[PDB]
Amino acid sequence: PALKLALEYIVPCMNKHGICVVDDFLGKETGQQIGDEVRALHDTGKFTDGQLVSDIRGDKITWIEGKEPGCETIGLLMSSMDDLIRHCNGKLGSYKINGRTKAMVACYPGNGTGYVRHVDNPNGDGRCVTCIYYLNKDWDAKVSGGILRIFPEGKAQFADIEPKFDRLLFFWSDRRNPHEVQPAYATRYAITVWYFDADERARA
């Protein structure tokens, strides 16, 4: 229920906390299909070899426009993220969201790598909202790790997000939300898109 989710949940939660989670976003049939497509990209070698950690390598990535052969349902996910944001009108902060990046599909290989603490957009590059879709069936963070931990600015607490199947996450891309991915001991997939604020971007 896009507009309803938008108006009753995503808008008030973002404006109050700046971090929001939607479980069971596309449902398990579409979700599995996205899973399958991401796995096919992995098995057919479309991912990079992974972030040079040490040689130990971490998260493998691939940029996905949405129209590529074999990425149709990823395309569908993207269109559906786009619908959510659009049905938010201009009510996320005072931002006017007019574009987004392609989809970054990330795959942690399960070798104990994660991702160091960072801010997605620390220097005003246009990106106002980070949108992440998780695809990991029966993820148990107690056993496989890979929690996304956010450190909201000015709070003395963590916000730990499990990379659960069919979960969608929004958070502010700027310094309000430093985050890290804790070590992952199982294959962990996520798809991220960033939304641009027209003014910040016209001006980057």
- Residues of this chain that interact with Ni ion (CB under 5 A) are 120
87 belongs to an annotated ligand binding site: no
Q: Does 191 sit near ligand 4JR (CB under 6 A)?
A: no
Tokens describing residue 91? 């009510």
* Site for ligand 4JR contains 174 (CB under 6 A): no
Contact between 97 and ligand 4JR per CB under 6 A:
no
Q: Is 188 annotated as a binding residue?
A: yes
Say which amino acid occupies 76: L
**Residue 11 near which of ligand 4JR, Ni ion, none (CB within 5-8 Å, type-dependent):** none
| Nearest distance, CB of residue 134 and Ni ion, angstroms | 14
- Footprint on residues 118-137 left by ligand 4JR (CB under 6 A): 118, 120, 125
Provide the 8-state DSSP code for 10: I
Residue with tokens 């990379």: 163
Q: What is the dihedral of CA 161, 9, 99, 18, to 10 degrees?
A: -50
**What is the C-alpha to C-alpha distance for residues 156 and 122, in angstroms, rounded to an integer?**
21
194 binds, among ligand 4JR, Ni ion, none (CB under 5 to 8 A by kind): ligand 4JR
Reported in sequence order, the residue ranges of the chain that DSSP labels E, i.e. its strands, are 19-22, 60-64, 97-100, 103-108, 115-118, 127-134, 148-150, 159-161, 168-172, 179-181, 188-197
Query: Which of 46, 164, 167, 179 forms a contact with ligand 4JR (CB under 6 A)?
Result: 179
168 binds ligand 4JR, rule: CB under 6 A: no
Quick note: the x/- pattern for ligand 4JR over 17-56, rule CB under 6 A, is ----------------------------------------
The letter for the amino acid at 184 is A
194 binds ligand 4JR (CB under 6 A): yes
Q: 30 is written with which tokens?
A: 């579409």
Task: Indicate the residue type of 59.
Answer: D
Pairing, β 19-22 against β 168-172? antiparallel
Name the binding residues: 118, 120, 179, 188
Name the binding residues for Fe cation: 118, 120, 179
Chain residues binding ligand 4JR by CB under 6 A are: 59, 101, 106, 115, 118, 120, 125, 148, 179, 181, 192, 194
